[PDB]
Amino acid sequence: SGRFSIKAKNYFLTYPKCDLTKENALSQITNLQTPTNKLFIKICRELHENGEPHLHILIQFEGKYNCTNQRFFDLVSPTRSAHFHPNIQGAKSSSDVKSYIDKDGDVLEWGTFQIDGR
């Protein structure tokens, strides 16, 4: 009846068993346009206990972005003719992002984050 429409300032992409690198995702994500504006970009890789390679992404736009289409975050393999459909998730938190941001460790840092208000 309804449609998939997400509206949040924070968005998290999850790629299950995705052999996609942070560089490719960083380039694709970075090259990924938005109706708002891309501020900070945090890409961290994580492997599941299932032995499947997972990737984590955390971006924060200056304004609330409407992710009512899972075609924008559509990442494909630039080395293989395979497409991947990441799961878009809206962070109901605000600063909580900073908490996770602190949790560094072999990750790609792009852009500069800025918490509006205190």
Side-chain angles (χ1 to χ4, degrees), residues 1 7 17 28 31 38 41 45 49-50 52 54 69-70 72 76 86 89-90 94 96 105-106 115:
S1 261
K7 246 215 119 212
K17 205 216 294 120
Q28 283 202 71
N31 290 129
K38 279 183 120 59
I41 294 167
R45 199 221 288 168
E49 260 133 289
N50 279 58
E52 66 174 326
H54 159 236
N69 199 6
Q70 41 149 99
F72 162 49
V76 310
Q89 284 204 352
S94 176
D96 196 89
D106 324 320
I115 304 140

mmCIF file of all heavy atoms in Angstrom, residues 1 7 17 28 31 38 41 45 49-50 52 54 69-70 72 76 86 89-90 94 96 105-106 115:
data_model
loop_
_atom_site.group_PDB
_atom_site.id
_atom_site.type_symbol
_atom_site.label_atom_id
_atom_site.label_comp_id
_atom_site.label_asym_id
_atom_site.label_seq_id
_atom_site.Cartn_x
_atom_site.Cartn_y
_atom_site.Cartn_z
ATOM 1 N N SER A 1 0.833 -1.190 0.000
ATOM 2 C CA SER A 1 0.000 0.000 0.000
ATOM 3 C C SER A 1 0.877 1.253 0.000
ATOM 4 O O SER A 1 0.655 2.171 -0.788
ATOM 5 C CB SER A 1 -0.943 0.013 1.205
ATOM 6 O OG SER A 1 -2.250 -0.442 0.866
ATOM 7 N N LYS A 7 13.481 9.220 5.785
ATOM 8 C CA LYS A 7 13.854 10.616 5.941
ATOM 9 C C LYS A 7 14.641 10.786 7.241
ATOM 10 O O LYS A 7 14.083 10.657 8.330
ATOM 11 C CB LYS A 7 12.619 11.515 5.847
ATOM 12 C CG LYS A 7 12.687 12.411 4.609
ATOM 13 C CD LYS A 7 12.074 13.784 4.893
ATOM 14 C CE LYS A 7 13.109 14.896 4.705
ATOM 15 N NZ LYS A 7 12.839 16.018 5.632
ATOM 16 N N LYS A 17 27.892 -9.977 2.952
ATOM 17 C CA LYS A 17 28.752 -10.759 2.081
ATOM 18 C C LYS A 17 29.120 -9.925 0.852
ATOM 19 O O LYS A 17 29.015 -10.399 -0.278
ATOM 20 C CB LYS A 17 28.094 -12.098 1.741
ATOM 21 C CG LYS A 17 29.146 -13.152 1.389
ATOM 22 C CD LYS A 17 28.638 -14.087 0.289
ATOM 23 C CE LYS A 17 27.464 -14.933 0.789
ATOM 24 N NZ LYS A 17 26.257 -14.678 -0.028
ATOM 25 N N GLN A 28 32.205 5.617 -5.001
ATOM 26 C CA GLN A 28 30.828 5.548 -5.459
ATOM 27 C C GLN A 28 29.930 6.414 -4.572
ATOM 28 O O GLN A 28 29.113 7.184 -5.074
ATOM 29 C CB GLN A 28 30.332 4.101 -5.493
ATOM 30 C CG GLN A 28 30.877 3.364 -6.718
ATOM 31 C CD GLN A 28 30.009 2.151 -7.059
ATOM 32 O OE1 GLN A 28 28.888 2.268 -7.525
ATOM 33 N NE2 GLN A 28 30.588 0.982 -6.800
ATOM 34 N N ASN A 31 30.870 9.915 -5.009
ATOM 35 C CA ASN A 31 30.415 10.350 -6.319
ATOM 36 C C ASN A 31 28.886 10.324 -6.357
ATOM 37 O O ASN A 31 28.276 10.829 -7.299
ATOM 38 C CB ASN A 31 30.931 9.419 -7.418
ATOM 39 C CG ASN A 31 32.442 9.576 -7.604
ATOM 40 O OD1 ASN A 31 33.196 8.617 -7.608
ATOM 41 N ND2 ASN A 31 32.840 10.836 -7.758
ATOM 42 N N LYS A 38 26.539 16.290 1.098
ATOM 43 C CA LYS A 38 27.353 15.317 1.808
ATOM 44 C C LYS A 38 28.379 16.052 2.673
ATOM 45 O O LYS A 38 29.183 16.830 2.162
ATOM 46 C CB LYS A 38 27.974 14.322 0.827
ATOM 47 C CG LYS A 38 26.969 13.237 0.435
ATOM 48 C CD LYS A 38 27.609 12.204 -0.494
ATOM 49 C CE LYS A 38 27.571 10.807 0.129
ATOM 50 N NZ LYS A 38 26.176 10.403 0.411
ATOM 51 N N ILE A 41 31.825 11.393 5.907
ATOM 52 C CA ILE A 41 31.651 10.044 5.396
ATOM 53 C C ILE A 41 32.566 9.090 6.166
ATOM 54 O O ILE A 41 33.780 9.283 6.205
ATOM 55 C CB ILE A 41 31.865 10.014 3.882
ATOM 56 C CG1 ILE A 41 30.771 10.799 3.157
ATOM 57 C CG2 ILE A 41 31.972 8.575 3.372
ATOM 58 C CD1 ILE A 41 31.146 11.038 1.693
ATOM 59 N N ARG A 45 34.878 -1.456 7.527
ATOM 60 C CA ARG A 45 34.601 -2.819 7.105
ATOM 61 C C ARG A 45 34.471 -3.735 8.323
ATOM 62 O O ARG A 45 35.186 -3.569 9.309
ATOM 63 C CB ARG A 45 35.711 -3.348 6.193
ATOM 64 C CG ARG A 45 35.224 -4.547 5.377
ATOM 65 C CD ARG A 45 36.301 -5.632 5.301
ATOM 66 N NE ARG A 45 37.397 -5.195 4.410
ATOM 67 C CZ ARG A 45 38.583 -5.812 4.320
ATOM 68 N NH1 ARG A 45 38.833 -6.896 5.066
ATOM 69 N NH2 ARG A 45 39.520 -5.345 3.482
ATOM 70 N N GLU A 49 30.445 -13.269 11.654
ATOM 71 C CA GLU A 49 30.901 -14.529 12.214
ATOM 72 C C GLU A 49 30.496 -15.691 11.305
ATOM 73 O O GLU A 49 30.898 -16.832 11.533
ATOM 74 C CB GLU A 49 30.360 -14.728 13.631
ATOM 75 C CG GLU A 49 31.421 -14.380 14.677
ATOM 76 C CD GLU A 49 30.837 -13.487 15.774
ATOM 77 O OE1 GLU A 49 30.558 -12.311 15.459
ATOM 78 O OE2 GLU A 49 30.684 -14.002 16.904
ATOM 79 N N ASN A 50 29.707 -15.362 10.293
ATOM 80 C CA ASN A 50 29.242 -16.364 9.350
ATOM 81 C C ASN A 50 30.320 -16.594 8.286
ATOM 82 O O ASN A 50 30.151 -17.426 7.396
ATOM 83 C CB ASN A 50 27.968 -15.903 8.638
ATOM 84 C CG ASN A 50 26.737 -16.136 9.516
ATOM 85 O OD1 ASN A 50 26.627 -15.637 10.623
ATOM 86 N ND2 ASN A 50 25.818 -16.922 8.961
ATOM 87 N N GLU A 52 31.181 -14.326 6.292
ATOM 88 C CA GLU A 52 30.827 -13.449 5.189
ATOM 89 C C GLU A 52 31.338 -12.031 5.451
ATOM 90 O O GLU A 52 31.149 -11.492 6.540
ATOM 91 C CB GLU A 52 29.316 -13.452 4.949
ATOM 92 C CG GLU A 52 28.572 -12.831 6.134
ATOM 93 C CD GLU A 52 27.078 -12.689 5.830
ATOM 94 O OE1 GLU A 52 26.763 -12.431 4.649
ATOM 95 O OE2 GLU A 52 26.289 -12.842 6.786
ATOM 96 N N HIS A 54 31.348 -8.244 5.478
ATOM 97 C CA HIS A 54 30.339 -7.200 5.542
ATOM 98 C C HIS A 54 31.016 -5.829 5.526
ATOM 99 O O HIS A 54 32.171 -5.698 5.929
ATOM 100 C CB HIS A 54 29.428 -7.399 6.756
ATOM 101 C CG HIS A 54 28.701 -6.148 7.189
ATOM 102 N ND1 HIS A 54 28.782 -5.641 8.475
ATOM 103 C CD2 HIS A 54 27.881 -5.308 6.495
ATOM 104 C CE1 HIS A 54 28.039 -4.547 8.540
ATOM 105 N NE2 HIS A 54 27.481 -4.342 7.311
ATOM 106 N N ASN A 69 14.375 5.602 -2.156
ATOM 107 C CA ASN A 69 14.757 4.840 -3.333
ATOM 108 C C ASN A 69 16.081 4.124 -3.063
ATOM 109 O O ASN A 69 17.097 4.765 -2.800
ATOM 110 C CB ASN A 69 14.954 5.756 -4.542
ATOM 111 C CG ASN A 69 14.891 4.962 -5.848
ATOM 112 O OD1 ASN A 69 14.604 3.777 -5.871
ATOM 113 N ND2 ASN A 69 15.176 5.679 -6.932
ATOM 114 N N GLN A 70 16.027 2.801 -3.138
ATOM 115 C CA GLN A 70 17.211 1.989 -2.905
ATOM 116 C C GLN A 70 17.970 1.770 -4.215
ATOM 117 O O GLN A 70 18.502 0.688 -4.454
ATOM 118 C CB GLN A 70 16.840 0.654 -2.256
ATOM 119 C CG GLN A 70 15.568 0.076 -2.880
ATOM 120 C CD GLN A 70 15.592 -1.453 -2.857
ATOM 121 O OE1 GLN A 70 14.999 -2.098 -2.009
ATOM 122 N NE2 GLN A 70 16.312 -1.997 -3.836
ATOM 123 N N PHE A 72 19.823 4.670 -5.397
ATOM 124 C CA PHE A 72 20.876 5.666 -5.297
ATOM 125 C C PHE A 72 22.126 5.078 -4.641
ATOM 126 O O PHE A 72 23.247 5.370 -5.058
ATOM 127 C CB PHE A 72 20.339 6.798 -4.419
ATOM 128 C CG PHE A 72 21.426 7.714 -3.852
ATOM 129 C CD1 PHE A 72 22.383 8.225 -4.673
ATOM 130 C CD2 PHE A 72 21.435 8.019 -2.526
ATOM 131 C CE1 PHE A 72 23.391 9.074 -4.147
ATOM 132 C CE2 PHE A 72 22.444 8.868 -2.000
ATOM 133 C CZ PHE A 72 23.400 9.379 -2.822
ATOM 134 N N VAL A 76 27.932 -1.270 -7.310
ATOM 135 C CA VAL A 76 28.275 -2.407 -8.148
ATOM 136 C C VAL A 76 29.791 -2.610 -8.129
ATOM 137 O O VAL A 76 30.535 -1.720 -7.721
ATOM 138 C CB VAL A 76 27.716 -2.203 -9.558
ATOM 139 C CG1 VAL A 76 26.237 -1.816 -9.511
ATOM 140 C CG2 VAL A 76 28.532 -1.161 -10.326
ATOM 141 N N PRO A 86 22.537 -2.386 -1.185
ATOM 142 C CA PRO A 86 22.746 -2.152 0.232
ATOM 143 C C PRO A 86 21.434 -1.771 0.923
ATOM 144 O O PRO A 86 20.510 -1.277 0.281
ATOM 145 C CB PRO A 86 23.793 -1.053 0.300
ATOM 146 C CG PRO A 86 23.792 -0.392 -1.068
ATOM 147 C CD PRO A 86 23.031 -1.297 -2.023
ATOM 148 N N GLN A 89 19.466 2.565 6.192
ATOM 149 C CA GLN A 89 18.917 2.661 7.533
ATOM 150 C C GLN A 89 19.070 4.086 8.069
ATOM 151 O O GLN A 89 20.140 4.683 7.960
ATOM 152 C CB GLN A 89 19.578 1.650 8.470
ATOM 153 C CG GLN A 89 19.037 0.240 8.226
ATOM 154 C CD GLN A 89 19.213 -0.639 9.467
ATOM 155 O OE1 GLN A 89 19.856 -0.268 10.435
ATOM 156 N NE2 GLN A 89 18.607 -1.819 9.383
ATOM 157 N N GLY A 90 17.983 4.592 8.634
ATOM 158 C CA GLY A 90 17.983 5.936 9.187
ATOM 159 C C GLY A 90 18.309 5.914 10.682
ATOM 160 O O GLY A 90 17.623 5.253 11.460
ATOM 161 N N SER A 94 21.495 11.199 16.871
ATOM 162 C CA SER A 94 22.146 12.372 16.311
ATOM 163 C C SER A 94 23.637 12.355 16.653
ATOM 164 O O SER A 94 24.480 12.248 15.763
ATOM 165 C CB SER A 94 21.498 13.660 16.826
ATOM 166 O OG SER A 94 22.182 14.822 16.365
ATOM 167 N N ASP A 96 24.894 10.096 18.646
ATOM 168 C CA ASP A 96 25.251 8.690 18.727
ATOM 169 C C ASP A 96 26.224 8.349 17.596
ATOM 170 O O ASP A 96 26.995 7.397 17.702
ATOM 171 C CB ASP A 96 24.017 7.797 18.575
ATOM 172 C CG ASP A 96 24.209 6.347 19.020
ATOM 173 O OD1 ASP A 96 23.965 6.084 20.218
ATOM 174 O OD2 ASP A 96 24.596 5.533 18.155
ATOM 175 N N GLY A 105 39.372 2.236 13.616
ATOM 176 C CA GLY A 105 40.065 0.972 13.433
ATOM 177 C C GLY A 105 39.970 0.499 11.981
ATOM 178 O O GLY A 105 38.978 -0.110 11.588
ATOM 179 N N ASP A 106 41.017 0.799 11.226
ATOM 180 C CA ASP A 106 41.064 0.412 9.826
ATOM 181 C C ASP A 106 39.775 0.859 9.134
ATOM 182 O O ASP A 106 38.943 0.031 8.768
ATOM 183 C CB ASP A 106 41.177 -1.107 9.678
ATOM 184 C CG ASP A 106 42.031 -1.799 10.742
ATOM 185 O OD1 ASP A 106 43.082 -1.218 11.093
ATOM 186 O OD2 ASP A 106 41.615 -2.892 11.180
ATOM 187 N N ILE A 115 28.414 18.718 14.296
ATOM 188 C CA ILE A 115 27.174 18.592 15.041
ATOM 189 C C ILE A 115 26.523 19.970 15.176
ATOM 190 O O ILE A 115 27.059 20.851 15.846
ATOM 191 C CB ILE A 115 27.421 17.894 16.380
ATOM 192 C CG1 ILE A 115 28.086 16.532 16.174
ATOM 193 C CG2 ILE A 115 26.127 17.784 17.189
ATOM 194 C CD1 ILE A 115 29.152 16.275 17.242
#
